[PDB]
Every structure is written in structure tokens, then in C-alpha cells.
């Protein structure tokens, strides 16, 4: 089978709604599966959020070192490492590696109130040229992930294409670009997202989501040994509100588009 017959035979297997946006970067060539639809991004909205600093730290040198505070009524449902320093400061830059490699969703909220809402990291997703992209709410509300509803969403394309620019491409200055791309590497919660469908030695950086409705996403950067990157979003949504969440699913749709690179 071809490989969008065998993503097909995925989603129908699923139980659910598979995106898919694979650019190689090779030849700049595309695998796209649903990839004009919109889907919840959940905290793979992140990315831009933390991206959207990193511009502003392009024209200001003290920005990245900027203190926060952190407050006991800062903490949400999963705040891992914001809860480490209540009472205390914590820099934007170490904010930015917290919501990115550790999905801390006080983190998330801090980003978003320092550059001053939601809308806020909309602008910026436009200023990037992307025009699906959008921010409507803090987190943890931002992942209710209630299919058809436009909130808080972006399509696998529009996500893979400013990824792609993000990391690899035109959107931020050297040193900012490389920051982004030092963050999405050390990522710690995507073992069994995309990189598990990879060969183990590729390197790879990722933001993952999970929401309700069983919304499993994550979006990647990918270095094969030889040859040009890839970059990968797999969304995936179910019907159900209380649907488990499959990352399997997305592992396995790593595996059918990244084969023979
Ligand atoms: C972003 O996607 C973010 N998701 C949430 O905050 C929600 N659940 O996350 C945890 C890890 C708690 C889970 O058990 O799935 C969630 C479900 S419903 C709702 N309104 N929010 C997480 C923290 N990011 S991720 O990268 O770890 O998935």
C-alpha cells in the first residue's frame, strides 16, 4: 500500500481523526493527511508562545533574564516545575524551558501573560505568516479539545510549515532560532510520541499535547544521520470526551511517513 493508504488504514483502525504534515526538507516535498483541517493543538500551542518571547529578546538583551514571580494561585492542574519555586523568581527563559520541555502549564500561563494575552501569540503566529494558527485561552482550558470548536486550534500544515520555519527557517535570529531548537530537544514527555515510531539514534525535538476528547498531538524536528530534516506534526483527535489518550497512534504515523529516510 501506498503511504496515504496506509495512513488512511490507520485513522480507520484509530477510532478517531489523524492530521498529518511531513515536510522534507530534502526536496521540500510533503505527505499530508487531513492537513487543512483544524484541530485543537492543546500544549503544542506552546511553541509559539515561548517563540513569540524569544522574538521580543532579538531587540531586548535583558528579556531572557527578566525575573517572574511565582505565586502559590499561579499553580494550575500540572505544574511541575513552577511548584518547585512558589515563593520565589523564575527567569522568562527558564519559563520558556519549563512550558517546552516539561509541558509546566503555569509556565504556559506566564508566557502568555507576559506578552499580554492570548491574542498576543495569535499576532505573532501572522507575523510568522501564519494565518490558521490561533490562541484563544490560558492554560489549562486551552486543551478541552471539544471537536468542531475553533478555539485554540491550527491545521497540521499551517503547524509543520511554521515549525519548519521556526526552527529550521526565517522566523527568529540565529541565536533565538538555536535557543528554540536547544529547548524542543530536551524535551521529556515525548518518549512514546513520534520518537518512538523513529530509529533510536535519530536526534529529535518535540512539543507534545494531550487533551480531552482523547487529543493526542505532537509536532517534531527531525535530524536523520544522513540526510536533510524532516519535520512531522501528528494530531490526533477522538469523539469521545473521556477518551483515552494514544500516542501510540502517533508513533505509528511516525513510523509509516519516515520510512526509507
Ligand atoms: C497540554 O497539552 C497539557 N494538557 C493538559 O493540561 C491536560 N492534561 O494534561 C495531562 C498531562 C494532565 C494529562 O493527564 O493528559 C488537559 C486535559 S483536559 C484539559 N483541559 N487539560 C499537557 C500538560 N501537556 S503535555 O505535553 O504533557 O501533554
Given at each position: 500500500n501506498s503511504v496515504q493508504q496506509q495512513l488512511e488504514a490507520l485513522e480507520k483502525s484509530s477510532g478517531g481523526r489523524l492530521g498529518v504534515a511531513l515536510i522534507n526538507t530534502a526536496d521540500n516535498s510533503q505527505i499530508l493527511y487531513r492537513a487543512d483541517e483544524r484541530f485543537a493543538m492543546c500544549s503544542t500551542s506552546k511553541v509559539m508562545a515561548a517563540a513569540a518571547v524569544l522574538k521580543q529578546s532579538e531587540?531586548?538583551?535583558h528579556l531572557l533574564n527578566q525575573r517572574v514571580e511565582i505565586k502559590k494561585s499561579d499553580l494550575v492542574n500540572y505544574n511541575p516545575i513552577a511548584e518547585k519555586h512558589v515563593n520565589g523568581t523564575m527567569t522568562l527563559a527558564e519559563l520558556g524551558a519549563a512550558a517546552l520541555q516539561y509541558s509546566d502549564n503555569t509556565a504556559m500561563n506566564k508566557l502568555i501573560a507576559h506578552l499580554g494575552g492570548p491574542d498576543k501569540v495569535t499576532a505573532f503566529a501572522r507575523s510568522l505568516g501564519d494565518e490558521t494558527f490561533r490562541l484563544?485561552?490560558?492554560?489549562?482550558?486551552?486543551?478541552?479539545?471539544?471537536?468542531g470548536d475553533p478555539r485554540d486550534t491550527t491545521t497540521p500544515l499551517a503547524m509543520a510549515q511554521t515549525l519548519k520555519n521556526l526552527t529550521l527557517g526565517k522566523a527568529l535570529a540565529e541565536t533565538q532560532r538555536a535557543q528554540l531548537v536547544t529547548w524542543l530537544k530536551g524535551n521529556t514527555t515525548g518518549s512514546a510520541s513520534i520518537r518512538a515510531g523513529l530509529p533510536k539514534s535519530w536526534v529529535v525535538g518535540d512539543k507534545t499535547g494531550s487533551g480531552d476528547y482523547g487529543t493526542t498531538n505532537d509536532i517534531a524536528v527531525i535530524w536523520p544521520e544522513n540526510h536533510a530534516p524532516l519535520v512531522l506534526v501528528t494530531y490526533f483527535?477522538?469523539?469521545?470526551?473521556?477518551?483515552?489518550?494514544?500516542?501510540d497512534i502517533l508513533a505509528a504515523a511516525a513510523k509509516i511517513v519516515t520510512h526509507g529516510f
Amino acid at each position: 500500500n501506498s503511504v496515504q493508504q496506509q495512513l488512511e488504514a490507520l485513522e480507520k483502525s484509530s477510532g478517531g481523526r489523524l492530521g498529518v504534515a511531513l515536510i522534507n526538507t530534502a526536496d521540500n516535498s510533503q505527505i499530508l493527511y487531513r492537513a487543512d483541517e483544524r484541530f485543537a493543538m492543546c500544549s503544542t500551542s506552546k511553541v509559539m508562545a515561548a517563540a513569540a518571547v524569544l522574538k521580543q529578546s532579538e531587540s531586548d538583551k535583558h528579556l531572557l533574564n527578566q525575573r517572574v514571580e511565582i505565586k502559590k494561585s499561579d499553580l494550575v492542574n500540572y505544574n511541575p516545575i513552577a511548584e518547585k519555586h512558589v515563593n520565589g523568581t523564575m527567569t522568562l527563559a527558564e519559563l520558556g524551558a519549563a512550558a517546552l520541555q516539561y509541558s509546566d502549564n503555569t509556565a504556559m500561563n506566564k508566557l502568555i501573560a507576559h506578552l499580554g494575552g492570548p491574542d498576543k501569540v495569535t499576532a505573532f503566529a501572522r507575523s510568522l505568516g501564519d494565518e490558521t494558527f490561533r490562541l484563544d485561552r490560558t492554560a489549562p482550558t486551552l486543551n478541552t479539545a471539544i471537536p468542531g470548536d475553533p478555539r485554540d486550534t491550527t491545521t497540521p500544515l499551517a503547524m509543520a510549515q511554521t515549525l519548519k520555519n521556526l526552527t529550521l527557517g526565517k522566523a527568529l535570529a540565529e541565536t533565538q532560532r538555536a535557543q528554540l531548537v536547544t529547548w524542543l530537544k530536551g524535551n521529556t514527555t515525548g518518549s512514546a510520541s513520534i520518537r518512538a515510531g523513529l530509529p533510536k539514534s535519530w536526534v529529535v525535538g518535540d512539543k507534545t499535547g494531550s487533551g480531552d476528547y482523547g487529543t493526542t498531538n505532537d509536532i517534531a524536528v527531525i535530524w536523520p544521520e544522513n540526510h536533510a530534516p524532516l519535520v512531522l506534526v501528528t494530531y490526533f483527535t477522538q469523539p469521545e470526551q473521556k477518551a483515552e489518550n494514544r500516542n501510540d497512534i502517533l508513533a505509528a504515523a511516525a513510523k509509516i511517513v519516515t520510512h526509507g529516510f
